[PDB]
Structure formats: structure tokens, C-alpha cells
Symmetry: C3
Subunit: 494 residues, 3 copies
């Protein structure tokens, strides 16, 4: 007697997934949605190269530390790369005011151009070539920051400087200047003539007065003196006014600056790779559409959500053993190779496996749609994650840390449990589809066949391969065989 | 050829929903939980009107910029509305110290009353009516901030001012004063007699000393001088002590202030609408119990969660085609109008429809309960979202931006995937209810009935319409009919 | 006549759960995953005791308010406990600079040792014991901070102090000093001889100059004078240099400091309980593996996620009523006691209950695994939640408040909806298991038994207890009884 059986795909896969109720469940196909790979390279960000200060800090680069070795200034960059402890930074010891805000402002710059705004010819009554220190050596000779001029008395006199510069360019000007804290009255009168001095700086918004602190300090880079640097953004058609009778570190060069987007400073030792990316980490770039990653927290760009997890494996295929699906249908079919759910016939032209095209295709569509929903519903926007707070801003640094940790906890929990729940529902989806197929066949045949209890029906008539693929194609004629079935059904012993 | 069939509700609805596995699925009823509408108006917040500063800033309003409204009498407000760039703000150029913290303090005030604390009679040895400037015109002629007094020398002398004020009121006092940075020694001697001057201010907590910075600056509103203003909160029974020999901008009016909660500053040009609301946005107010909205991020009040989404549509009804639904039941019944699941019979009396009332009521209750759970479990508390950090606080503002973006991403992902998953579970719930109905009669009928294979049953006797409503009301009597059925059953072959 | 029935566990439990579709559903067993209990004590944190300042503030403890203990007996601590308003705090009025950052630095200290760095023998030409005030009582008599020295003129002279201290220890040194703001020229010359004075402090990084503000102030603790204190971290092998000609409040003691982690300051009056914990709240400690709690927001340690909820009750057992459960199987069996799903048989030998162990064990395993997944997938890391921003940092405090509120909203919503959805699915899981068991038996028996419509089958042959235990084990011998069954079936009809 001919029979027809309902079954499902099996294969050689050893891939495992977890569900909310079961762990280490072998399946026929799975997919990780957690991005774990990076190119180990520093790349352009959306087509724009980073500004890689390799042996210089932002401060030394800006002021023109003569000990920083190379300076092919670039007119635009997407982020700044410093390494962890730059060797060259403020050769003469001191400070750059509002340094962290300045670095954040310079993180991403649309246009950057160094220009000469006050040449040394502007100081006819002051010495312009002796403002030089062994703390800032160039090629064995004492020197100084190149973009600023350390003015010194001339003929034992330091006349009061009163000068102004109008920003006649059409871009903002980043301007830097400084004041020198000398060590004692003798050094004060040696460098400048006047013992009590000041530096006044004024713009439309700036109203600054600095007085040197002549006091004992510890030696740093061989110097007990200090130099405090300050900066401003001079808008077009505004003028900056300087006045000073000593200790003035005057601007010489400044920077035309056009700023649009923001970014941060990345600390990294990885090397530039002539690549492009939308998501950069300090150990490499990420090219991924996945919603989650575990590579590094300090990312710049449009990145997946950072989670603490080793794998996020969604089940795509069926339960695999290399109620349905290991219930009343005892097991899977390695023999069925071209589908997920299908049939196995046996008449007397032969045996074979044949996949049910329609339910297999709709289950594949549904599982693919589920994966694509878990991926595509993730909103990813540009974010720049750095560490931009100083030693006296640790409360804000802790606020940021609590924010980062909270978002990591939220995303980790949500992703893990989403994977578990949707894996369990995918396996149940397979179970219900298989049972629905068995019932579709049961309702095509009714009492022209006997249920055998293992997923198979036994025909009360002969069912040729046209009758068989008519059972698969949805095309079984019950009233036709109604009596070939009738007579063999009542002819049953025993 | 008598028949009875199991079926479900259908209608003309074209509403679509998405599930995690299927897109654009038409259903009989749906409900959006995403709020997308606003009244386009600025409203009271929980019964308290906002302080709408027309074309004036908080600074100009507080100090009494003469182009600012002096006849402003709002003793209470819930939030402040500024325009993007107010025209009237510090007519005489300069600064108001801790301006952003002061605006945050003033965001929501329970009581606000301007009072005279130091009358102009208090300065007998100084000129009180010469402190007037073209930078602060009233009706085109020179004037000054109205709540503060620019004291000028008298008879070429400026005696040292030593004055105090004890807060004998019962509320905190917001007190403002200032110092004038003159331009040169000549102007210094012209306005005040003394070349070297100061302003000292003392309370229980304040210990302030201000010295004028006499230097060259750029012209702003026609003035190269500056005025730096400062403020304090004088607690009841505490006294403020002022001392100065020049450049003093003395208090005249101050503000009794009672604060019982915070809010923020809203930037908006939308107009007041004499309305009330629990959630205000810069483009309109929101009246909604929904858990999510997509109108605007900078909201004040008890608002739904802001997400980046165009619709969040939950399925309430069933799959609509204008292992059950679209499985063996070819389609739904437009004819059944008063329920979700039910029956359709056809015998010699006629055909008709009857809904299974009790499973229909339980499905409606469950779907309504699911919608109400997705809505009611949302915790919504008061939050005030603004932009309160200045140009040199970009790191903190980026921290706030990262927080807002992270919460938007979290809520968007969670809402989208919750809607998808619960829609899939709702549709499967309908499928299971219909299959359970197909089975409930099958087990009431057993071998008193024949399965017909497309959702319909065949009776093994003819069953009057009282027997039918016994099949539906749960009380069909099997030993009643069993041998009328068995004798005719043993007769249909055929 | 012989029968076998499918049924499920019941008991007398009245515990209720909610699902996303049903409220107040009685079940056989439930489990709350919300931690709600605390031990009402302040405990060690991961083995490290807290530093409990009793009625002293960090300022009074550090400077040595004579009413404060030395708190030298704890060399390490995990967090600091202050009362809401410490009584002993800066007895002489004034300020401690960067006080909040200093408290954050001192929140958790790995090693802490008070050492003498400048003994009073270092001041041979200054008075060291007259710096005493009624604002700083010891036993009702005027005194002063003990770890700092109020230097006063000697023989109507105050020679210029120039002193240095080299950090010859191998840990960082916390060093504090101050300046005294006198009230008038007469008091200035009375305490120090020189009318115009200064204090200069220098290290490798510090470059500070302080000038006294001689001005009129309000009385605080009976004094109109003030004292402004400052602090620095002197790194090993660096030296601090002090210079001053008056008003100098000089250091005597300092603190060796070893820091390895941070924390926060907890405000609490609860007492130390000689306990240990991983999560501390201001009202008691928490010992819990649960993922959520509702006890208190200001926690320190590895805590559950704080949510706004009274219960998060997951269903573990079955639906209990003292589409299977209440579908065709009318109700549960109080009589069946060692299983969840099972059978009830009746033949010649007797009637009894027998659990289907295999489905019972895997359902128990799955439910336990679901609970353990909801618990274990929670990532919990160390966090310290305090209130560390001052009266002029309300914008940052509001940013932190918005972050905390946002995370509470997220966690509350997610936990509530997770419990609702997983309760739904657990109940549906039980129903599906019962239906699968009924189908296992139905497909073993086929036409050797009649379905009875209530969960029971009636045998068309005699089924002894071995035949019964073959039906339970899934291995019923259909061809063995099939022909007796067909003959008795053809006999009974009829
Ligand atoms: C910095 O330099 C610019 C000049 O490059 C200064 O702005 C200039 O101001 C003059 C008048 O103040 C403008 O001239 C023209 O004057 C007639 C008056 O009859 C007026 O009708 C024209 O529309 C125009 O205003 C000149 O265009 C303008 N230049 C620019 C580039 O705006 C500026 O004031 C200087 N800043 C300081 C602080 O000195
Ligand atoms: C401000 O004024 C009030 C009184 O107008 C002062 O408070 C009084 O202080 C004396 C003690 O010296 C008490 O006997 C009175 O009962 C107080 N009066 C009130 C109304 O409280 C207060 O000290 C003054 N403050 C300052 C800084 O001078
Ligand atoms: C400050 O203290 C340090 C610690 O001893 C001194 O550094 C040592 O100096 C001696 C001699 O110069 C060396 O042999 C040691 O190797 C140094 N130790 C370290 C860790 O550097 C330092 O010289 C002291 N400075 C002063 C001015 O006394
Ligand atoms: C799951 O499999 C891995 C090996 O691939 C094993 O290390 C782990 O312990 C397994 N987990 C359980 C719960 O059996
Ligand atoms: C769903 O419908 C919208 C129009 O209502 C259409 O734009 C969109 O492409 C449709 N999506 C699919 C997958 O058919
Ligand atoms: C659930 O039970 C509690 C008391 O046990 C009751 O207060 C509450 O109203 C009940 N909920 C419903 C929906 O009946």
C-alpha cells in the first residue's frame, strides 16, 4: 500500500542557539547579529582623514613647539588622534587655558589655515629675536614656540605696547597669546625693564587682564618659570586689542577656522590605513549593518550599540538532530535537501523526498523578515565618544560613566532577551508550520487514507506520482478516489 | 447536503499593521499608540501661565533695559519663553555673571515681586541722574537700566560709599549690582574722581571684590566701556554690605522670589493660546495619554517618550481580506457582523450566522487589556528639556546630547519591536481561537458528526435550531442523538 | 469500558499573576523578581568598611575642627557617610575650594595616613598659639582647626615666610592651606603687621596667589571675617613652596593618599551594622541576585536596576482554578501530586493517577531556565549614586536627574512588559504541553479507542496496567489490539 509522509529539513549543522527556555539547541542555520570584527586600522571618516598628531599634543601643535618634528598642516579633518602620552607638549612649562574645550572645538574642522597676523616688524621698540629658551631647543640651539613671539626689552627699556588687529578675513580667527611668570625680581628686570607688569586683552566679548605671579615654583623641563597661554575666536570685522608693559607672549601666527560638525579626540596607537569608514574605534574601524557590537566603547561615527556580550545568535533554520518536530513526527530528514518542510512519498513507481515550495518559501520570508526587523529597526545616529574632562572634573566624568554604563546595561539586557525570546518563537514557528502541513494533507485525504500516527498517511487506493504531486500541489481529488478508498476500507482484516 | 461551518469576522477595513514576520498585513481594526498631533500653541502648564519675554532677554528684563517692559506683572510662571535672538539684552555692553544658572533658577518661580530696596535718596554725596547712555536709549534719547543706578561723582568728588541692606522681608531676595570698566584714566577721572577704585560686596556667603579693567576694547552698541553685573540671593534676616569709591552700578530695585521647583527656558516664536496642558513643546502643546510621541524633543512637562517613528500601529482586530485564518478557512465572513468568531449553518429551514459570544468576549477583553497594558505601564514623570549651556560648555552639552540620543534610540527600538512582536502574537491568538472553536464542536459532536474538511461539519442527524444553540451555548447532549445518528450514519454509503 | 484521561496539576495556591491579556490570574506557583527588602543597616562594601563621619563634614574632618575626631583609625574605606547637616563643619566661616571634587576624590581611598609635614618649630618669628576664635570652640573655649596653623605677628612684626616641603613619601600628599580675610585696616595691622599682604603657593603644576579681601561682611558664627581654604595633591618627589607676609593659614598636617577607585558620599543617619554587602542604600543594605529593586535610588555597589513598581511576579506553575486547560479538559486535578501533566486510568485492576514525567521534567526545566535567564542576563556593574553638585551647578544636577529618571522609566517599562509577555507565554506553554500530551495519546490509540470529548479516551479492548504504562511511555502496540478493537467497535454499532 502507498503512503505519504510529512517531514522537515535536517542537515550536518552543529551550530547552537539559546532560547528563553532551552540552552545549547542545535539548529540547521543560525546568524550572529553581534559585530565582532574590525580592520585594525585608522581610517578616514565619511571621506575625511583624521588629524593624526603623532608626537605632538594639540597645545604644542597649535603654539608651534619647535621640538615637534613634522607639520604638513591639513585644511580639514574629521577627528583628532593623539596618542596616550605625547612626548612634545609645552616645551617651556605652563598652561593652555580652557584646553579641553579648545580640543573639543578643534575635534572636527571644516577649514584650517595658518596665517601671519602680526609680523615681528610690528615691534620696532622691543627685542624680537632673544625670546628664546633651552627648554625649547631646535637643532641644538635654544628656541621657542614658533607661532608666538616672546618679546624682550630693548636698550634696557620696555615701552608700553598698545596694538590692535582687525579680522579682515571672512572666517573666524583662532588667536593665541600668553603671559610669562618669571622667577624673581632680578629675572623680571633682566627680561623686561619694568618690575610690575600686566597684559590686557580686549575684543567685543573678551575683557581680560593678566598679572605675572613672580614666585618660587618647582622645576619642570629645567625651568621654574611658567607660561600661561590663552585663546579666543575673533569673529570677522571684530578687532583684538593688546596692551602690555612686560611679560607679554604676543601672537605672531593665527588660524583661519571654519567649523561645522563636532567630534572628539581619540587616543590610539593604531596606524593609518588609507581606508574609509562610518564607525571608528581606537583599535580599528567597523564596516557593519549589525545593531550591536562588543569591540570598543570609545567610538566615533554611526556605530552599532555597544554591549557586553560574546555572541547574539538568532536561529534561522530548524531544530536539528545530526506534537511536531521531535513529537509525533519522530525526527528530521537528512534526505530532504531543497526545503524546510515537505513530503516523502511511496508508491510503486518509486520513493522520494519533495519539498513543499509554498510553506517553505513563506517561512523563509518570515524568518528573513524577522532578522531584518531586528536589524533595520535600530536607529543609529552619529556619536563621538571620548574622555574630555580634566583632573578637577571627575564628577562630570562619573556622570558620563554612569550614562555609558546604563546604556550598555540596557542594550545588553534587551539584546540578550530579544534573541532568546525570538529564538523560542522561531522554533515554535517551525513546529506550527509542520503541524499545519500535516493537517492540510489530512484534510486533502480524509477517509481516503488512514492516519498512521507518525506523520504518515496510508492510502486506501493507489496514488501514482501524478496523484502524489497532486497531494503536494494542493490538488487532491477526494470524491474521485472515493470508492477505490471505499472498497479497500471496508475490505480490512485484521 | 446540510452544513455548519466555523468562521470569523471580516469587514471593509484597509488598516494595515506589521508583525515581526509579515509586513503590510490588512486587519479589521487597528490602533496607533504614537502621538503625532499638537495644538500649535503655547499654553499654561498645569494651570500656570508661562513668562513670555517678548523680544527681551532674561538679562535685559531683570536689569530693566529701558526698551524692556517695565509694566510686566507676572507674579508666577511655570516656564520662560524666549525668542531665538532677543533684540533687547544688555543695552550697555558687558556681562551678567552666572547667567545660565540664573536663568535655570528663574525657569519656574512660585512668587516674584519687584520691590524698591535702595532709593535714590540714599546717595546724598553722589550724582544719581547722570548715569545715562546712548547705548541704552529710551524713545531715542540716552537712558539706562531702570532697576540699577549708575552713580557719578559730585562736585569733583566721589566719597567712599558704605551702605547695607537687611532683608526684612519673608522671602529670598534676588539682588543685582555691577561694575563699570572705563576706557582710560581721563574718562575714569571724568566720571569718578578716584583713579584706583573697587567694589566690595559681602553677605553671609558672598565675599566679592571687583576692580575695573581700564583698557582699550572694541566698540559694542557704540561703547568701548563695559559693565559686568553680578547677582546674589539674600536670605531673610541676612544683610548685604556694599562699599565702593567708584565705578559702582548700585542696586535700586530687587526681587522677592519664592521657588518651589524647576523647569527650563523654551526657545519659541509660537504664540500663547490661553490653553492648559501637561506637556508643552516649542511648536505646540500635547494632550495625550499615549506612551510615545514624535513631535519635538525639547519638551516641558509630563510627556510621552520621544521616538523617531512615523507610526506605532497595534492590531486589535483579525486578519482581513476585503493554522486557521487563511489556512483551512478560506477567508473571513463579511456576513457575520456582531462578533469575532462564530458559526454559519445551512439546513432546510435556512442559513444563518451566530457568533460564539463567550470566546468573542474573551478575545475582545484580552486585546483591549493588551493595548491598555502597553499604554498604562508607561511611567511618565515631569522633565524639562532645554539648551542651557554656553559656548565654553560644549563638553557638557555634548554629554546631554549623547544622553538624549541614547534614550531616543532605546525607546524607538523598544517601541518598534514591541509593536511587531505583540502584533504577531495577536494574530496568532486569533488563529488559535478559531482552531479551538473548530475543535470545541468536534469534541462535543464526536461520532455523532462528520468532518467536511474546509471549516465545515456535516451532521449525522438533522439538528433543529434549539439543538444548534445547544451546540453553541455548551450543552449538546451526546447520548440524546447518538443512535438516530448511528443508524443514519450506518446509511450514508451511499 | 476501560479509560485513560489526560490532565494537569492543580493545588490550593491563591497566588496571582498578570499577563499582557489577563489580570489577576490564579496559578499554582509564582516568583517575585523584584527585590523589596533591606537589612536596615550600613555595612562594609565588598569587605571594606565605610568612613563614617559622625557629625563632622569632610571639611571639618580634614582641617581638624577641634570638635572633630582625627578619623585616623580607618586606613581605607569604600564610601563616606555624612549626616544630612553635619554639626561640625568649617567652624570659622568661609570656603574650601573645589570642595565637591575633593569629596569625590576622597569617596573611596585605598590608603590614607595623616602625617606631620610642617611643625610649629618652623615658625620661630611668628606667633603660633594666638590664632583662636569663639567660632571654633573646643570645650566651650575658643580654639581653631588643629591640622592648620593661624600664624600671627610676633613683637609687632610679621617677617615674610618662605618655606618648602618636598614629598619624600612614595604616595600622593593631600595638602591644605588657607588665607584669612580680615575686616578692616585696624584688625589687619593688629593680627599681622603689614597692611597689604599675599600668599603664594607653587608646585610643578600649582601657581597660586591669594590676596585678602578686607571688607564688611555679615556675622557668621559670631565672625565677620572669613577664611578661604585651598588644597592640592603633591605628587611624590615634588615640592610645595609657600611664601607670605600675612594672613597665611599654614599647613601642619597632611594626608598620604593612595587611590584606586572612586565612589560617592552617602547621606544617612542609619548606624553601622558590622555586616558586609555588595549593594548599600542610605536606609539599608541589599543582598540579592534579583535584577530589579524598588528600595532607594541613591545606591552604592553592584545593585539591581532601580524601578518604580511594587511587584514583578513571574508565573512558574500552571493556571489554577479552585486550547487545553479550560478548553476540552474542563479543569485541573487536585489528586495528581508528583507532576505537572499526566494521566488517569481505569481498568479491572484499578484507577489511579500517573504523571507524564518526561513532559513534566522538560516543562519544569524550561520554566526554571526562563526565570534564570531573566535573572542572569542582567549585567550589573559597580555604580555610586550620590548628590555631588552645589547650588550653582543646578544645570548639571538637572542633567543627572534627567538621566536617572530616564533610566528608571526605561527599566520600569521593560521589566513590567517582560513580566506580562513572559507570563502570557508561560501559560500558553502549559496549555500547548497538555494538548501535545493529549495528541500523543490520541495518535498512539487511533481507532482502537473512542475520543470522549473531555480529555479521556475509552478503549475498544481491555488495557491492563502494562498496556496503560505503554500508552504513558509513548509505545502503545496498536497492531496488537487493532483487530479485537475493530470487532468490538463493529459490535457496539449496533
Ligand atoms: C574692522 O574693519 C572693518 C572694515 O573692514 C570695520 O567695519 C567697517 O565700517 C565702515 C563704517 O563704520 C563700513 O563702511 C561703510 O560706511 C557707510 C557709511 O556711510 C555705510 O553706509 C556702508 O554700508 C558701510 O557701513 C565698512 O563697510 C565696514 N567694513 C566691513 C568689512 O564691515 C570694523 O568696524 C572694524 N572693527 C573695529 C573694531 O574697528
Ligand atoms: C535684620 O533685622 C532683624 C530685625 O529687624 C534682626 O533680627 C533681630 O535680632 C535680635 C537679636 O539681636 C532679636 O532679638 C530680634 O527678635 C530679631 N528680629 C527679628 C524680626 O527676627 C536681624 O539680626 C537683622 N540682621 C542683620 C544681619 O543685621
Ligand atoms: C625630594 O625627595 C626625593 C626622594 O628622596 C629626592 O629624590 C632622590 O634624590 C636622590 C639624590 O638626588 C637620588 O639618589 C634618589 O634616587 C632620588 N629618588 C627619587 C625617587 O627621585 C629629591 O632629590 C628630593 N629633592 C630635594 C630638593 O630634596
Ligand atoms: C554549551 O556548550 C558549550 C560547548 O560548546 C559548553 O561549554 C557549555 O557548558 C554548554 N552549556 C550547557 C548549559 O550545557
Ligand atoms: C506597504 O505599503 C506602503 C504604502 O501604504 C508602500 O509604500 C510600501 O512599499 C509597502 N511595503 C511592502 C513591503 O509592500
Ligand atoms: C486584583 O486583586 C486586587 C486584590 O487582590 C484588587 O484590588 C484588584 O482590583 C484586582 N484587579 C482586578 C482587575 O480585578
Amino acid at each position: 500500500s502507498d503512503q505519504i509522509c510529512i517531514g522537515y529539513h535536517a542537515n550536518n549543522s552543529t551550530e547552537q542557539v539559546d532560547t528563553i527556555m532551552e540552552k545549547n539547541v542545535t539548529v540547521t542555520h543560525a546568524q550572529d547579529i553581534l559585530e565582532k570584527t574590525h580592520n585594525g586600522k585608522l581610517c578616514d571618516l565619511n571621506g575625511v582623514k583624521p588629524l593624526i598628531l603623532k608626537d605632538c599634543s594639540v597645545a604644542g601643535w597649535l603654539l608651534g613647539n619647535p621640538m615637534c618634528d613634522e607639520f604638513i598642516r591639513v585644511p580639514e579633518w574629521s577627528y583628532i588622534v593623539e596618542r596616550a602620552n605625547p612626548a612634545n607638549d609645552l616645551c617651556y612649562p605652563g598652561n593652555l587655558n580652557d584646553y579641553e574645550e579648545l580640543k573639543h572645538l578643534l575635534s572636527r574642522i571644516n577649514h584650517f589655515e595658518k596665517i601671519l597676523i602680526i609680523p615681528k616688524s610690528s615691534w620696532p621698540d622691543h627685542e624680537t629675536s632673544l625670546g628664546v629658551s633651552a627648554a625649547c631647543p631646535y637643532q641644538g640651539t635654544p628656541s621657542f614656540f614658533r607661532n608666538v613671539v616672546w618679546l624682550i626689552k630693548k636698550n634696557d627699556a620696555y615701552p608700553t605696547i598698545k596694538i590692535s588687529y582687525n579680522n579682515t578675513n571672512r572666517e573666524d580667527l583662532l588667536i593665541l597669546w600668553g603671559i610669562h611668570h618669571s622667577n624673581n625680581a632680578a629675572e623680571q628686570t633682566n627680561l623686561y625693564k619694568n618690575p610690575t607688569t600686566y597684559v590686557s586683552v580686549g575684543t567685543s566679548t573678551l575683557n581680560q587682564r593678566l598679572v605675572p605671579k613672580i614666585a618660587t615654583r618647582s622645576q619642570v623641563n629645567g625651568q621654574r618659570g611658567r607660561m600661561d597661554f590663552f585663546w579666543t575666536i575673533l569673529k570677522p570685522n571684530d578687532a583684538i586689542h593688546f596692551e602690555s608693559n612686560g611679560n607679554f607672549i604676543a601672537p605672531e601666527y593665527a588660524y583661519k577656522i571654519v567649523k561645522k560638525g563636532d567630534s572628539t579626540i581619540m587616543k590610539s596607537e593604531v596606524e593609518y590605513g588609507h581606508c574609509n569608514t562610518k564607525c571608528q574605534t581606537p583599535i580599528g574601524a567597523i564596516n557593519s549593518s549589525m545593531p550591536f557590537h562588543n569591540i570598543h566603547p570609545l567610538t566615533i561615527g554611526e556605530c552599532p550599540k555597544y554591549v557586553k556580550s560574546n555572541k547574539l545568535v538568532l536561529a534561522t533554520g530548524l531544530r536539528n538532530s545530526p506534537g511536531a518536530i521531535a513529537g509525533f513526527i519522530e525526527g528530521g530528514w537528512q534526505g530532504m535537501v531543497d526545503g524546510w518542510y515537505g513530503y516523502h512519498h511511496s508508491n510503486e513507481q518509486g520513493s522520494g523526498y519533495a519539498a513543499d515550495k509554498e510553506s517553505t518559501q513563506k517561512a523563509i520570508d518570515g524568518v528573513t523578515n524577522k532578522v531584518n526587523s531586528i536589524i533595520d529597526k535600530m536607529n543609529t545616529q552619529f556619536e563621538a565618544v571620548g574622555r574630555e574632562f580634566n583632573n578637577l572634573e571627575r564628577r562630570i566624568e562619573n556622570l558620563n560613566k554612569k550614562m555609558e554604563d546604563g546604556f550598555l546595561d540596557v542594550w545588553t539586557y534587551n539584546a540578550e532577551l530579544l534573541v532568546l525570546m525570538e529564538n523560542e518563537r522561531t522554533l515554535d514557528f517551525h513546529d506550527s508550520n509542520v503541524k499545519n502541513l500535516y493537517d492540510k494533507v489530512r484534510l486533502q485525504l480524509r477517509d481516503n487514507a488512514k492516519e498512521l500516527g507518525n506523520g504518515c498517511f496510508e492510502f486506501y487506493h493507489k496514488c501514482d506520482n501524478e496523484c502524489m504531486e497532486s497531494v503536494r500541489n494542493g490538488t487532491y481529488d477526494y470524491p474521485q478516489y472515493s470508492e477505490e478508498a471505499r472498497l479497500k476500507r471496508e475490505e480490512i482484516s485484521g
